Design a protein around this ligand. Structure first.
Ligand SMILES: CCCCCCCCCCCCCCCCCC(=O)OC[C@H](COP(=O)([O-])OCC(O)COP(=O)([O-])OC[C@@H](COC(=O)CCCCCCCCCCCCCCCCC)OC(=O)CCCCCCCCCCCCCCCCC)OC(=O)CCCCCCCCCCCCCCCCC
Ligand SMILES: CCCCCCCCCCCCCCCCCC(=O)OC[C@H](COP(=O)([O-])OCC(O)COP(=O)([O-])OC[C@@H](COC(=O)CCCCCCCCCCCCCCCCC)OC(=O)CCCCCCCCCCCCCCCCC)OC(=O)CCCCCCCCCCCCCCCCC
Ligand SMILES: CCCCCCCCCCCCCCCCCC(=O)OC[C@H](COP(=O)([O-])OCC(O)COP(=O)([O-])OC[C@@H](COC(=O)CCCCCCCCCCCCCCCCC)OC(=O)CCCCCCCCCCCCCCCCC)OC(=O)CCCCCCCCCCCCCCCCC
Ligand SMILES: CCCCCCCCCCCCCCCCCC(=O)OC[C@H](COP(=O)([O-])OCC(O)COP(=O)([O-])OC[C@@H](COC(=O)CCCCCCCCCCCCCCCCC)OC(=O)CCCCCCCCCCCCCCCCC)OC(=O)CCCCCCCCCCCCCCCCC
Ligand code: HEA
Ligand code: HEA
Ligand SMILES: CCCCCCCCCCCCCCCC(=O)O[C@H](COC(=O)CCCCCCC[C@@H](C)CCCCCCCCC)COP(=O)(O)O[C@H]1[C@H](O)[C@H](O)[C@H](O)[C@@H](O)[C@@H]1O
Ligand SMILES: CCCCCCCC/C=C\CCCCCCCC(=O)OC[C@H](COP(=O)(O)OCCN)OC(=O)CCCCCCCCCCCCCCC
Ligand SMILES: [Cu+2]
Ligand SMILES: [Cu+2]
Lengths: 67, 203, 139, 145, 92, 109, 552
């Protein structure tokens, strides 16, 4: 009855309930770890990020810096 | 090339193995045979009712149901079962020519079954029932006519496997293909023994 | 193997039991008579499991214990060469297009499209089944 | 010999199959899952116009830093053309070290400029953005061959 | 195993510098292999503009204009998503 | 071309394949604008994937039936190489030459 | 001492590695991924079709769409939820993980699985193709009773396209049945006998058995119906025996079709439990018998749908429908024993498993409440039966398919999902689904029978239709988190390097890489019991695994 009510109900209560559950479940902290704070020491295991860029020991060069 | 890395008897292998291993296209066509038996169960249930309905002398007046042309083509088809089984006996022992002779004559008298069934359909529609004409005429034309489609598909499998025997070396995989088409078509003419007992003898 | 024969023997025992009890309980107890439409469906589902279980029993008697099927079998006891599986193949998509053309000829009752779709079914089924048997071009 | 301390076991060959407790993860990289995608884009997509596997090392190197960076260039999976960057936030040391065949390919002026373009972003406090602004610079510097 | 190797020296070529690298498409030197991508962006956007111009005509069935709005909004959404991802470098 | 033709028998298509005639000429009228874009996408990426399908038949071999590895449980497809082989399970990968490379050991000897 | 990995894996993949590989699929993996993709696309099509029906039922007028479009709407909807969403996915999870579970390199007939998938898709498109037709698709229901389907009645082209679309889809699913039963029979790892296979490949063994039993009678019924429409061929003629000739063998397809729907999702959920209960599946041989104890009787139970016709042997089918309700109760109490005294964590696929448990519970209580014919003589074709088959069937396929996707997702694409977004997905596919079907029990018990396009304001019960509409549109916005989750979990999302992204994995699947190699296995484990991945990953566990595996 009262077609504004039975259209606004079926069009809003899904979106109201979607907003409520998406603001109580997606505002949690996910399983992904936090970004690395630079001031904190390096607690992680050592990381090498290779490239696989052309697919298939002696020294080449050097450079350095101190931030 | 150097020699090969897939140093086998052919590019095609058996299906797994068959000395201490079940043949896998064999069990594949066995369970698909069983599915098509349930398809024929659908056709049999379309027959065994609409015969409980019609009472009295129930095969109707335009259906002079010819048995004198039915039982020769059933005898042709079930002797052709033994020709096809002799073909698979000549397929186990590996010669293509013993396979091809018995499957050529199996294809020829299976084609003779299809042409005899087609002449029975012509001779039974031109002075009798049509598929919109009767209940019994319609169920006779579908319970055995789509069996005509089964046996014409089996004939397509025969001519197709014979071209396959023409184009490659006789592997044990091709004996697997031969035994698979062999008892697919044996299933076809054991279902036709069931249909010929049902339609003509038992009624 | 052994246990597929026992499995479809269990299915055969139950399907035959249900078929004969449905036939003899719709012989009486029904309005007109035997239903003839689930009765023969039960008799031929007994036939289905007869075919599968009888073939699996034929195989299981004409066989030793399979090195696959054997309880307490190391992987090196059954590590040989399996048979041919097909690699990449563009014929099943053509099987489906052919059988769908035949089906939409049998739906929209177009006998030209029935005959053409059946011709494409024969052509594509040949292309599937000969795919690993075409020899090289003899020139 | 020790595997991963719970749940892993080496298989019938040398591949060590491990586990992951069901809510937890596998990699545990302490960086967001979107900016290291930008790192992989700057290190694969916008790197292939340099023809060198740009390695990036973030672990500790608490020794003679050049020698312990050119020692861990030797396991970059083709060490003759690889431009490794090593950064140690325990130690505050950038170290860009080359492979052999990368030599005079626009690279001797790109390594200190790559260190400067990295360390201008490390002192802000962005590890990943520092690595991205270094690898983009060394991609613009190293010329292909 | 009954095969020989194949060796073809073509006339290889813009000359092998600008376009697509040989690892994006596995054979870029063997033929023309990269449309410039503003052409396909403006081609999609002009396709959707043409579908929106197609309302103007002999027309009483407005059930069609929802198909034209739909197939124009799909193309505008794909072009806008694709241009936005190249503006941010394929992110999200 | 196939669209402008297959919406020129617009009449008899909507006759036999029971479609509203207005609907199939709108299908054509949108199809000549969107179906070249769809077939451009499918054609371009399908040509690139046909390239990649015969640029992995060089880096690997030609595919056949499966052998298991002996002491452990593996499944390799037993690739048959086209060029010279190295001492181990991988050959020397050939270069492309604009030729139709055979993808079935069937079509080999 | 340290590896050399990419920082993130390949996001999309190279340009052009899939679309020809679409056309020339031969591994089970990519075919199963295609099943899950295109059948969730048909699930989307059906869901919007249901939302059209449910906009229509929100008010007693015919305010939104017509009568005839509604009668097309529930029919095409019932098919692309049963015969084009459920029926494919019961082999789609087979092509996902059954050769992974039995140690098979590929599925047994690796072109005929592509043939199964492509026949499915091109039966599905030519059955949806009734909507292009001007009179539309089939106005008669999914049940499709024969004095309504013979060409005097519903004479349009859409019913014919429906018929031959189910012909092609049935043939493709028969072919999925044969190649799955031949995998599980004779393409299997060398250490596992019949009994230490997983329960899921067991359910697909018996499911493919019942596919071969059921679906050729769908094609036989339906070739008879296509002949009776086009040739005018008197088989399903009503003054002949041909209105129980439809009902007997169509429901002899239909109820074995809904148990080939129900059984491999029982297998999914029975695989979900032992890796989140951190323990055995309780009574494994009890399930391995109970699948047969439900599925053999599934064939012989078929006429519990024609209680209203008054023409079936009534105590026989009522007794055997109670007797098919008991072994699924066994299969259920084994699951309650499987969660029993375990260390549960409700990460998302087990959360969908528990949602399935609750829905299938009270739906099956409506099953035993509905299979008694005097309690069905008012309820046949009411909304109690439609909330019954939703509150069962949705619970089986939809909840256990979301358990199957959120479980076998990191092993079929090598990347996890968002756990928060999956929990969002669950709670508003749980709250919304109960909102739209806990009230249709009370809406079919007081009168509103099935397949109506409108009702009256002088009839009551408008508020229960509007609360079903509220719930159905909660469920309509429920897969925005699901398609967003898989859309940002393929091309992005949290990767896995090591095996078992769900710890304490088992069932011989989880002993290979999370993108599994082509032909599935670099190292098979020594199979000893039902959980050989759990025995690879936990070797010290084995004596504790067997020393207390018998008491209870
Ligand atoms: C703020 C921004 C604005 C707002 C934006 C909104 C923000 C995002 C919202 C989301 C958008 C909504 C749509 C979501 C869909 C996206 C999902 C997706 O694609 O999957 C990701 C992914 C694609 O990757 P991607 O993220 O798109 O990026 C890839 C590249 O970056 C991109 O690839 P590329 O660089 O190669 O681009 C190719 C494309 C450029 O891309 C575009 O910009 C689109 C252009 C048009 C597109 C039209 C359709 C084609 C698209 C394919 C659809 C197939 C169906 O070029 C073309 O191919 C078409 C060129 C057009 C030519 C011009 C037309 C001229 C016609 C002739 C004129 C004649 C007229 C007169 C006639 C008279 C004659 C004389 O898909 C997959 O990899 C697997 C697909 C699996 C499918 C599962 C779905 C279920 C299927 C059920 C069956
Ligand atoms: C349909 C067109 C069929 C074209 C056959 C071409 C096959 C071929 O060239 O193989 C060469 C191959 C020899 O090369 P190879 O030794 O394997 O390797 C050499 C290369 O190195 C290795 O090269 P490759 O073998 O890896 O790949 C080459 C092959 C790969 O192409 C294929 O995969 C063919 C399958 C196409 C499937 C159609 C896509 C449909 C998309 C679904 C949505 C529909 C709604 O051919 C092509 O690239 C061009 C085919 C063009 C197809 C475009 C037409 C689609 C229109 C869509 C209609 C809607 O084998 C043959 O010679 C085959 C000859 C037989 C040709 C006729 C057989 C078909 C009979 C009729 C089927 C009934 C279909 C009903 C149509 C009506 C639709 C309503
Ligand atoms: C257990 C797993 C999870 C369960 C499934 C969950 C499904 C839930 C609902 C679906 C949402 C899922 C998200 C989908 C977006 C994909 C994002 C992603 O990362 O996926 C990449 C992911 C990674 O693949 P990859 O090998 O690493 O490289 C993909 C690259 O894009 C390279 O690929 P390519 O270059 O070789 O070809 C690219 C092309 C190839 O895809 C296709 O051509 C078929 C797509 C049909 C679109 C029809 C829509 C209507 O993709 C597209 O077409 C993009 C345009 C999409 C149009 C949709 C318009 C929406 C508005 O792809 C997959 O593994 C999924 C495979 C999906 C199979 C498609 C099934 C369709 C069946 C046959 C269609 C033939 C008839 C269609 C008519 C002709 C028109 C095309
Ligand atoms: C009812 C619908 C009929 C469907 C017929 C196919 C279903 C059979 C499936 C299980 C049987 C074993 C099997 O897996 O076949 C292997 C094979 C799968 O190849 P794969 O996956 O790469 O595995 C390698 C093979 O296992 C390696 O083993 P293989 O390559 O040696 O295969 C052994 C053998 C397989 O032998 C058989 O399957 C028995 C042949 C019975 C089919 C005859 C048609 C009966 C229905 C007619 C009424 C409708 O292949 C043959 O040499 C004979 C194939 C003849 C098929 C003829 C179909 C034409 C239909 C149109 C007839 C026109 C009349 C109507 C108007 O499937 C086929 O050869 C048949 C193609 C599928 C046609 C579907 C039509 C839509
Ligand atoms: C996934 C599919 C599915 C499943 C699994 C079911 C499972 C059941 N269904 Fe449902 N059903 C349908 C999909 C399903 N149904 C469909 C599609 C239709 C027809 C569509 C139409 O006609 O419109 C349908 C029509 C239908 C009818 C048709 C009558 C009518 O049209 O009104 C009946 C009644 O006989 C019915 C009864 C059952 C029963 C008894 C089960 C049983 O298997 C359920 C048993 C489960 C519980 C009983 C076990 C757990 C509970 C306890 C823990 C233990 C047991 C306790 C008891 C002993 C009290 N179903
Ligand atoms: C297989 C289980 C199943 C599923 C999943 C469905 C999906 C739904 N069904 Fe359907 N339903 C049946 C089993 C199912 N149904 C059966 C057996 C019939 C009977 C056929 C007959 O009677 O003949 C039926 C017909 C039916 C009726 C008809 C009865 C009548 O006419 O009175 C009703 C009642 O309202 C109904 C309720 C729902 C609801 C609320 C869903 C929800 O799950 C809704 C799902 C759809 C949305 C979730 C998708 C979201 C929308 C998209 C986001 C839009 C955009 C997508 C495009 C881009 C592609 N269903
Ligand atoms: C070989 C396989 C080919 C498969 C192709 C499958 C087709 C794809 C989908 C098609 C959807 C069609 C829906 C049409 C349904 C419909 O009838 O809608 C009509 C008009 O809609 C439309 O056409 C709009 C839809 C347009 C579709 C978009 C095109 C997509 C492209 C990509 C497809 C081209 C494919 C061509 C293939 C060629 C070969 C190429 C290789 C409304 O006009 P009308 O019905 O006359 O008037 C009404 C009164 O009747 C009614 O009483 C009154 O109520 C009013 O409504 C009034 O307006
Ligand atoms: C859908 C397939 C269903 C069943 C197939 C049964 C095959 C068995 C064929 C039955 C032969 C017969 O006996 O037909 C006698 C009557 C003659 O009556 P009339 O014309 O009125 O006489 C004139 C008087 N003035 O058939 C007829 O109506 C005319 C039509 C002829 C038979 C129909 C076509 C046969 C093949 C069907 C195509 C299969 C497609 C499968 C696609 C997946
Ligand atoms: Cu039922
Ligand atoms: Cu009813």
């Amino acid at each position: 009855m009262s077609t504004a009510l039975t259209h606004g109900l079926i069009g809003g209560v899904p979106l109201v309930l979607f907003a409520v559950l998406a603001l109580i479940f997606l505002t949690r902290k996910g399983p992904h770890p936090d970004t690395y704070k630079m001031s904190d020491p390096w607690t992680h295991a050592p990381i090498l990020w290779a490239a696989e860029e052309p697919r298939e020991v002696v020294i080449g060069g050097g450079a350095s810096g101190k931030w | 090339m150097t020699s090969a890395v897939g140093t086998s008897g052919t590019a095609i292998t058996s299906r797994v193995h068959s000395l201490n291993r079940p043949n896998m296209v064999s069990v594949g066509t066995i369970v698909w045979l069983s599915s098509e038996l349930m398809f024929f169960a659908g056709l049999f249930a379309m027959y065994f009712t609409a015969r409980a309905q019609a009472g009295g002398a129930w095969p109707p007046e335009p259906t002079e149901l010819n048995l004198a042309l039915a039982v020769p083509v059933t005898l042709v088809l079930i002797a052709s079962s033994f020709t096809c089984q002799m073909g698979v006996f000549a397929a186990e022992r590996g010669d293509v020519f013993g396979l091809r002779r018995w499957y050529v004559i199996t294809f020829l008298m299976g084609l003779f079954f299809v042409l005899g069934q087609g002449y029975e359909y012509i001779h039974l529609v031109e002075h009798g029932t049509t598929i919109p004409g009767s209940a019994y005429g319609s169920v006779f034309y579908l319970a055995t006519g789509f069996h005509g489609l089964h046996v014409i598909g089996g004939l397509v499998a025969f001519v197709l496997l014979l071209a396959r025997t023409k184009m490659s070396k006789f592997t044990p995989a091709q004996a697997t293909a031969a035994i698979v088409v062999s008892y697919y078509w044996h299933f076809v003419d054991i279902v036709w023994i069931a249909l010929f007992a049902t339609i003509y003898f038992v009624r | 193997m052994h246990i597929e024969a026992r499995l479809f023997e269990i299915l055969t025992a139950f399907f035959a039991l249900a078929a004969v009890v449905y036939a003899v309980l719709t012989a009486m107890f029904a309005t007109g008579g035997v239903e003839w439409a689930g009765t023969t469906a039960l008799v031929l589902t007994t036939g289905l499991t007869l075919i599968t279980g009888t073939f699996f029993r034929f195989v299981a008697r004409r066989l030793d214990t399979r090195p696959e099927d054997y309880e307490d079998a190391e992987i090196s006891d059954g590590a040989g060469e399996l048979g041919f599986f097909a690699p990449h193949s563009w014929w099943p998509i053509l099987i489906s297009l052919s059988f769908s053309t035949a089906a939409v000829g049998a739906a929209l009752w177009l006998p030209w499209l029935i005959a053409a779709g059946v011709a494409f079914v024969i052509t594509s089924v040949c292309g599937l089944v000969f795919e690993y048997y075409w020899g090289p071009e003899k020139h | 010999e020790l595997d991963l301390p719970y749940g892993s076991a080496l298989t019938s060959s040398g591949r060590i199959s491990a586990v992951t407790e069901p809510g937890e993860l596998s990699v545990h990289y302490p960086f967001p899952t979107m900016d290291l995608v930008v790192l992989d884009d700057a290190l694969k997509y916008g790197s292939r116009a340099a023809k060198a596997r740009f390695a990036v090392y973030i672990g500790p190197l608490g020794a003679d830093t050049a020698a312990t960076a050119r020692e861990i260039l030797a396991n970059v999976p083709t060490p003759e053309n690889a431009v490794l960057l090593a950064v140690s936030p325990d130690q505050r040391a950038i170290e860009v070290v080359y492979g052999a065949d990368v030599k005079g390919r626009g690279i001797e002026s790109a390594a200190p400029l790559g260190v400067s373009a990295a360390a201008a972003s490390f002192k802000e406090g962005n590890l990943i953005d520092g690595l991205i602004s270094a690898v983009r610079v060394m991609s613009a510097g190293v010329s292909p061959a | 195993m009954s095969s020989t190797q194949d060796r073809s020296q073509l006339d290889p070529e813009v000359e092998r510098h600008t376009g697509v690298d040989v690892e994006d498409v596995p054979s870029a030197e063997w033929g023309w292999s990269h449309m410039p991508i503003g052409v396909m962006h403006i081609g999609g956007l002009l396709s959707a503009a043409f579908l929106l111009v197609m309302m103007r005509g002999n027309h009483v069935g407005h059930v069609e204009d929802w198909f034209l709005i739909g197939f124009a909004a799909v193309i505008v959404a794909l072009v806008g998503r694709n241009w936005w991802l190249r503006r941010r470098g394929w992110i999200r | 071309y196939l669209l402008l033709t297959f919406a020129c028998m617009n009449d008899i298509i909507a006759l036999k394949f029971h479609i509203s005639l207005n609907a199939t000429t709108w299908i054509g009228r949108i199809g000549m604008v969107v179906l070249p874009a769809i077939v451009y996408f499918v054609a371009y990426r399908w040509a690139i994937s046909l390239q990649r399908s015969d640029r992995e038949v060089l880096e690997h071999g030609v595919e056949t039936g499966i052998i298991k590895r002996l002491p452990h449980g593996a499944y390799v497809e037993l690739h048959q190489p086209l060029g010279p082989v190295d001492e181990h399970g991988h050959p020397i990968p050939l270069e492309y030459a604009g030729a139709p490379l055979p993808k079935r050991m069937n079509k080999l000897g | 001492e340290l590896e050399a990995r990419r920082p993130f894996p390949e996001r999309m993949g190279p340009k052009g590695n899939l679309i020809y590989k679409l056309i020339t699929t031969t591994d089970h993996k990519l075919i199963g991924i295609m099943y899950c993709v295109v059948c969730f696309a048909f699930f989307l099509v059906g869901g919007l079709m249901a939302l059209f029906m449910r906009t229509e039922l929100a008010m007693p007028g015919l305010q939104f769409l017509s009568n005839e479009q509604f009668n097309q709407l529930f029919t095409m909807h019932g098919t692309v939820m049963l015969l084009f969403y459920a029926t494919p996915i019961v082999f789609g999870f087979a092509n996902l993980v059954l050769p992974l579970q039995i140690g098979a390199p590929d599925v047994a007939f690796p072109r005929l699985n592509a043939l199964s998938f492509w026949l499915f898709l091109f039966g599905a498109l030519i059955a949806i193709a009734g909507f292009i037709t001007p009179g539309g698709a089939a106005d008669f229901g999914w049940t499709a009773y024969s004095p309504l389907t013979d060409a005097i009645h519903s004479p349009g082209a859409g019913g014919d396209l429906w018929i031959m679309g189910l012909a092609v889809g049935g043939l493709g699913t028969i072919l999925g049945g044969v190649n799955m039963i031949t995998t599980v029979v004779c393409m299997r790892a060398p250490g596992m006998t019949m009994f230490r296979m997983p329960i899921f490949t067991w359910n697909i063994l018996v499911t493919s058995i019942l596919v071969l039993i059921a679906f050729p009678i769908l094609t036989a019924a339906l070739f008879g119906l296509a002949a009776d429409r086009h040739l005018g061929a008197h088989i399903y003629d009503p003054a002949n025996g041909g209105v129980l000739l439809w009902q007997h063998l169509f429901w002899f397809f239909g109820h074995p079709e809904v148990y080939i729907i129900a059984l491999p999702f029982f297998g999914i959920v029975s695989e979900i439990f032992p890796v989140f209960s951190r323990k055995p599946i309780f009574g494994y041989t009890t399930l391995i018998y109970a699948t047969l104890a439900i599925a053999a009787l599934s064939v012989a139970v078929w006429a519990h749908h024609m209680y209203a016709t008054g023409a079936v042997l009534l105590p026989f089918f009522s007794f055997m429908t109670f007797l098919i309700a008991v072994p699924t109760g066994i299969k259920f109490f084994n699951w309650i024993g499987t969660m029993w005294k375990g260390q549960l964590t409700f990460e998302t696929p087990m959360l969908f498993s528990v949602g399935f448990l609750i829905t299938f519970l009270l739906g099956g209580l409506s099953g035993v409440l509905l299979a008694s014919p005097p309690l069905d003589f008012h309820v046949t074709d009411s909304y109690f039966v439609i909330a019954h088959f939703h509150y069962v069937l949705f619970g089986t396929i939809v909840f256990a398919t979301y358990a199957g996707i959120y479980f076998w997702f990191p092993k079929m694409t090598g990347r996890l999902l968002d756990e928060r977004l999956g929990k969002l997905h669950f709670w508003l596919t749980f709250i919304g689904f109960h909102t739209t079907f806990l009230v249709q029990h009370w809406l079919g018990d007081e009168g509103m029978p099935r397949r109506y396009a409108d009702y009256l304001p002088t009839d009551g019960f408008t508020t229960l239709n509007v609360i079903s509409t509220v719930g159905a549109f909660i469920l309509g916005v429920s897969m925005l988190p699901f398609v967003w989750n898989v859309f940002k979990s393929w091309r992005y999302g949290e990767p896995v390097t090591v095996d078992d992204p769900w710890g304490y994995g088992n069932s011989l699947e989880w002993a290979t890489s999370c993108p599994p190699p082509r032909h599935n296995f670099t190292e098979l484990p020594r199979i000893r019991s039902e959980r050989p991945a759990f025995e690879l990953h936990y070797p010290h566990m084995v004596e504790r695994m067997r020393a207390e595996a018998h008491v209870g």
